[PDB]
Amino acid sequence: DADLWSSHDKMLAQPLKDSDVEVYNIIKKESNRQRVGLELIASENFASRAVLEALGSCLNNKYSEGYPGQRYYGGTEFIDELETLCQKRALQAYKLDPQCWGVNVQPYSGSPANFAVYTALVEPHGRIMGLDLPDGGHLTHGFMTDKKKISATSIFFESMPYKVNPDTGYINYDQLEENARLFHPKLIIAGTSCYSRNLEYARLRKIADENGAYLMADMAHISGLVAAGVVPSPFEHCHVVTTTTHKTLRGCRAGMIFYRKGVKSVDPKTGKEILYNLESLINSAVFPGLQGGPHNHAIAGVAVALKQAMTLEFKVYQHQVVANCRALSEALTELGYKIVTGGSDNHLILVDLRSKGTDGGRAEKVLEACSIACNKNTCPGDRSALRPSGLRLGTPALTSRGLLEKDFQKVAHFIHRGIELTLQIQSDTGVRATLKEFKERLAGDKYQAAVQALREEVESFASLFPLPGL
Ligand SMILES: *Cc1c(COP(=O)(O)O)cnc(C)c1O
Structure with missing residues (x-):
């Protein structure tokens, strides 16, 4: 009669942790994923x-x-x-x-x-x-x-x-x-x-x-x-x-x-x-x-x-966002990467991977497997939206975590290593191969250790920075 009615009142006041462990864990795993990862998707940030x-x-x-x-x-x-x-x-x-x-x-x-x-x-x-x-x-x-x-x-x-x-x-x-x-x-x-x-x-x-x-x-x-x-x-x-x-x-x-x-x-x-x-x-x-x-x-x-x-803290943050973008852009340019438009006036850049003999579709998956988050994107002059040549990299997410120019240069290096790995897999599966086959070779046993090696080095570096939220 009133035994279950008090249980109802206890249900609306019960913490998520106890009320829904299944959802609680998903949030926890996600928080962890965001912590150990390198977020470079331009549209991302941390509230x-x-x-x-x-x-x-x-x-x-x-x-x-x-x-x-x-x-x-x-x-x-x-x-x-x-x-x-x-x-x-x-x-x-x-x-x-x-x-x-x-x-x-x-x-x-x-x-x-x-x-x-x-x-x-x-x-x-x-x-x-x-x-x-x-x-x-x-x-x-x-x-x-x-x-x-x-x-x-x-x-x-x-x-x-x-x-x-x-x-x-x-x-x-x-x-x-x-x-x-x-x-x-x-x-x-x-x-x-x-x-x-x-x-x-x-x-x-x-x-x-x-x-x-x-x-x-x-x-x-x-x-x-x-x-x-x-x-x-x-x-x-x-x-x-x-x-x-x-x-x-x-x-x-x-x-x-x-x-x-x-x-x-x-x-x-x-x-x-x-x-x-x-x-x-x-x-x-x-x-x-x-x-x-x-x-x-x-x-x-x-x-x-x-x-x-x-606030002034925000103003400093935004200037740092652009400074980090310049740092990242020039680091990659110096490394032989083609940046569409040569540079940027803002928080992002579009890297034309044709300069390294590959595409953004394949590079996107490899970088993801190593906890490097970014997204593929067609470049001006692409004859097919199915095989986009570029990668869009933005700095607001990582900048919010404390990253500076020097850090973004290290990030640039990590990204390049991901591209080398991409090139390796690309040539290992042939020149007439499909994206489907590339994904299989990537998740394959041959490149299992290489991916894990780079992934771990990436995760330990990201783990050094705070994760806004909690
Ligand atoms: C992000 C964005 C939007 C808004 O997207 P929502 O996911 O619906 O919030 C709209 N226009 C542009 C140019 C954007 O980049």
Whole structure:
């Protein structure tokens, strides 16, 4: 009667460790995996303990559909304090005049943030232009083939990509300018997932105005760098700026949408001023358009991450991120590796493995087997996305653990050793071999000892550094 009811109360207060050992262990094994490994996936990072704590708060429970001062349900005085605080901070982090900029901090992640913007400004079947996927663009920027529209962006809107010059490695703004006059985009996306150089925002803005299109920046990858001023800000030339809250910003998974406010334009003779309406449209799209109840626990993590993003420690961190990237880039360049574009203005680089006689697909697996985390990626000039020539390496994750230039040089050496091992296996299985066979030889008995040797040396080196979280 009441024996089991007390057991119920004990169930909701019982620690994860006892309540679900199966899930507890998976988390433990994962924490260990992250500790002993070398994280070089550009999109990765480590959230601060303060941010992670906010996620487990009672904020999870409150349904707060709507916005501060425009809620559906009542009892949101504390939730309103939090959301208003989070957006106040978001504007500060980028030094934005509240009278000129506004922000929506409700997007569940980066992709939902982007889609929300298209839904509000582009509308069904409206045209969008983004960097081609194999050229370093993101799925949310549009992706389709002769056969089908793959990304939701291509499915609900009409997208056509602009490309990177296969020779230089830089975005071909000239071809974009030409095609925009033919396509008539309603919105141009200025953002990348795998690009080492700064974007010519002013030029993009010019091309946008010529076609009466919106210029939307997707700063997901460089959000942290832009915050610390380590890279030029997209806010000066863009109408809308979307972003992820994790990655280089070090918060929890979520997203934000920044939009222009105030005077859009004026009439020379009448003096009548037209104002921006981005705030209303974008807010309406997030809710009641696309999303439901806000994830207040995440909005807290974001708010916390934004306070940290404004500290000097963070600024130093971001400068170190770029310094480590330069160190890593030049170390590999000196070693005969071809870096697309020759270098980088940010946290990542794209290494063209054709310079060493191999590809990123094979190199990715070998490096993984040795606890070196990174991802394959097509290079400008690749005749097939099935056999990508490069590897995308980013420094934010390891930099957060304390790594410095000297450490990144050691990391560069470790990476090269992985490539040697890759080359060995590649030649050992023949020149007409498939990726399927390569994976088998890698997990085979012949290279078992070599992999373990390198893996252990990698793991013992990574183990020397702290792992933010706990
Ligand atoms: C990371 C990223 C996103 C957001 O991805 P989510 O996994 O949905 O958070 C969107 N656009 C770009 C360019 C990104 O790099």
